[PDB]
C-alpha cells in the first residue's frame, strides 16, 4: 500500500 | 565542458536508510526503504561506485558519519554520491531520534570544507518529504 | 576561484513543501524510477536528462492508492536542483 | 492519466538558496547577462539545461566581486537550475 | 514523448519585470544596471520568438493582478511561457516597489490545474533577485 | 560597481 515520507 | 570521470575510482555512494524511528519522534516505520536501498546499492555497484549503506542512524550518527567522509581523501575518486532515505520535512532529514538540517549535511561538502572533492560533482539524493501537502492533479 | 557552492546537484523526490510517496512493496516512487532509468541509460544520456525522464516516470505513471480518500489518487513529481558547472556522463 | 499540478516548471535562479545575488552597476547582473550570452550562442544547439549549466559554469568562473568595502570585496556567485520539468526543452 | 513540442504557431510571452526604483519608506536601494539586463532579455527572447512584454517599476499589487491576467490569457496557440522577475528579494520573496510577493503566489497563477491552456507545456520563471544575506567566499 | 540584490 501507497504511503507518505 | 563535462566532469572528468575517469579517475581511478568513481567515488563512494553513502547511502543513509532509515526504517524504524523511536516511538519519541511519532514516526511511522517506513515499510518497502529496504528494497529501495537494495535497489541503490545494486544501481551504483554498476556505475561502479563503492557502496556503503547505512541503517537506523540517530542525528547524530549521520553527522558524525558525513564529516567522517568529508574528512576522507578523495583525490583518487570522480565525485560523491550521498543518498538519504527517510521521513522529513522542508529542508529537514530525520534521524532515528529526531531532525537533522539538511544544510549541516551537505556543508561538510562545500568545496572549501573538503579539498579532495572541489570541482567535483556532489550528488545527494533525498528520498523525504517537504511537507504536508498533497498533488491532485490536473487530466490532460 | 570557485563558489563553495557550486558543483552540487540535489535531486530530491518531490516538490518543496509537499509529501513524498513511497509502496510498502515497491519502494520508493522516486528510487524506483531513479533506479530503472539509470539502469537502461547511464551508458546513453547525461545525467540531467536522465533525471528528466525520471521526472517523467514517476509524474505520468504512479498515482496514489488509499482507503482513505484524503490521501487517494495524487501525484507527484521530483525536483532536480542543479549548481553542478559541467555535463555529468557515467560513462 | 493525471499529471501533477507542480510539473512542467523551472526556476532559472540567479544565485543558491540562502545567498546574495550580484549586479553590476554599468553591465548589468552577472547571472543574466551570462544568461544571455549562453542563449545567443547555444539555443539553436544544446537542449536548455545544458545551456543553463554554461550559465552555471560561466557566473561561476568568470565572475568575482570587486568592492570599496571589504565585507563585500571578492565574492563568488553560484546559479540554481530547479527543474520539474518532464522532458527535454529545445528552442529550436 | 521526450521532447516539449515547440512547434505550435507561437512560441509564447516572455514577461519581463523589471523592478528598478523602491519606495523610499521600503529602505531599498536603488537597482542600477537592471535596464542593461531588461533590455538584453528583451533583444534575447525577440530572437526565439518570443512575445515580449516588459513592464517597469510595478508595486507587489501590480505584480500578482498582471500575472494573473496572463494567467487568464488563451496560451492555447503557444508552445511555452517565460516570465523573468528582476528586482530585489529574500528567499522564497520578489519585492514589488512597495513590498514584498511570494513567488508561490506568483507561479501558483501557473499551475496545471489553473493555467489550463498551458497544461503540459513548459512554464519558465527566470528570477535574478537576492535569496538571502550569506556572501560565497570562494575557494581557490 | 557590483552590488547585491
Redesign the interface.
Given at each position: 500500500?501507497?504511503?507518505?515520507? | 565542458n563535462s566532469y572528468k570521470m575517469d579517475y581511478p575510482e568513481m567515488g563512494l555512494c553513502i547511502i543513509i536508510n532509515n526504517k524504524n524511528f523511536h516511538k519519541s519522534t511519532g514516526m511511522?516505520s517506513?515499510?518497502?526503504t529496504d528494497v529501495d536501498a537494495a535497489n541503490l546499492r545494486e544501481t551504483f555497484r554498476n556505475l561502479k561506485y563503492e557502496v556503503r549503506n547505512k541503517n537506523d542512524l540517530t542525528r547524530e550518527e549521520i553527522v558524525e558519519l558525513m564529516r567522517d567522509v568529508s574528512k576522507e581523501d578523495h583525490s583518487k575518486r570522480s565525485s560523491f554520491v550521498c543518498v538519504l532515505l527517510?521521513?522529513?520535512e522542508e529542508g529537514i532529514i530525520f534521524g532515528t531520534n529526531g531532525p537533522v538540517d539538511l544544510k549541516k549535511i551537505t556543508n561538510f561538502f562545500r568545496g572549501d570544507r573538503c579539498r579532495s572533492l572541489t570541482g567535483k560533482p556532489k550528488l545527494f539524493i533525498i528520498?523525504?518529504?517537504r511537507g504536508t501537502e498533497l498533488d491532485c492533479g490536473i487530466e490532460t | 576561484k570557485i563558489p563553495v557552492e557550486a558543483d552540487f546537484l540535489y535531486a530530491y523526490?518531490t516538490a518543496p513543501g509537499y509529501?513524498?510517496?513511497?509502496?510498502?512493496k515497491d519502494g520508493?516512487w522516486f528510487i524506483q524510477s531513479l533506479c530503472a532509468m539509470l539502469k537502461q541509460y547511464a551508458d546513453k544520456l547525461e545525467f540531467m536528462h536522465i533525471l528528466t525522464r525520471v521526472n517523467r516516470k514517476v509524474a505520468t505513471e504512479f498515482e496514489?492508492?488509499?482507503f482513505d480518500a484524503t490521501?487517494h489518487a495524487k501525484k507527484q513529481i521530483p525536483c532536480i536542483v542543479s549548481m553542478l558547472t559541467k555535463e555529468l556522463y557515467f560513462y
Amino acid at each position: 500500500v501507497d504511503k507518505v515520507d | 565542458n563535462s566532469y572528468k570521470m575517469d579517475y581511478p575510482e568513481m567515488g563512494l555512494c553513502i547511502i543513509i536508510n532509515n526504517k524504524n524511528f523511536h516511538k519519541s519522534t511519532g514516526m511511522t516505520s517506513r515499510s518497502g526503504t529496504d528494497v529501495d536501498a537494495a535497489n541503490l546499492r545494486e544501481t551504483f555497484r554498476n556505475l561502479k561506485y563503492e557502496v556503503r549503506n547505512k541503517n537506523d542512524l540517530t542525528r547524530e550518527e549521520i553527522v558524525e558519519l558525513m564529516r567522517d567522509v568529508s574528512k576522507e581523501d578523495h583525490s583518487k575518486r570522480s565525485s560523491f554520491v550521498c543518498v538519504l532515505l527517510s521521513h522529513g520535512e522542508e529542508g529537514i532529514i530525520f534521524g532515528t531520534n529526531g531532525p537533522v538540517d539538511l544544510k549541516k549535511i551537505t556543508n561538510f561538502f562545500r568545496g572549501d570544507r573538503c579539498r579532495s572533492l572541489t570541482g567535483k560533482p556532489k550528488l545527494f539524493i533525498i528520498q523525504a518529504c517537504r511537507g504536508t501537502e498533497l498533488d491532485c492533479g490536473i487530466e490532460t | 576561484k570557485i563558489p563553495v557552492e557550486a558543483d552540487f546537484l540535489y535531486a530530491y523526490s518531490t516538490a518543496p513543501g509537499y509529501y513524498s510517496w513511497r509502496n510498502s512493496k515497491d519502494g520508493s516512487w522516486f528510487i524506483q524510477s531513479l533506479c530503472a532509468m539509470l539502469k537502461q541509460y547511464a551508458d546513453k544520456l547525461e545525467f540531467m536528462h536522465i533525471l528528466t525522464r525520471v521526472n517523467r516516470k514517476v509524474a505520468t505513471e504512479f498515482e496514489s492508492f488509499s482507503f482513505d480518500a484524503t490521501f487517494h489518487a495524487k501525484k507527484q513529481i521530483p525536483c532536480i536542483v542543479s549548481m553542478l558547472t559541467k555535463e555529468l556522463y557515467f560513462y
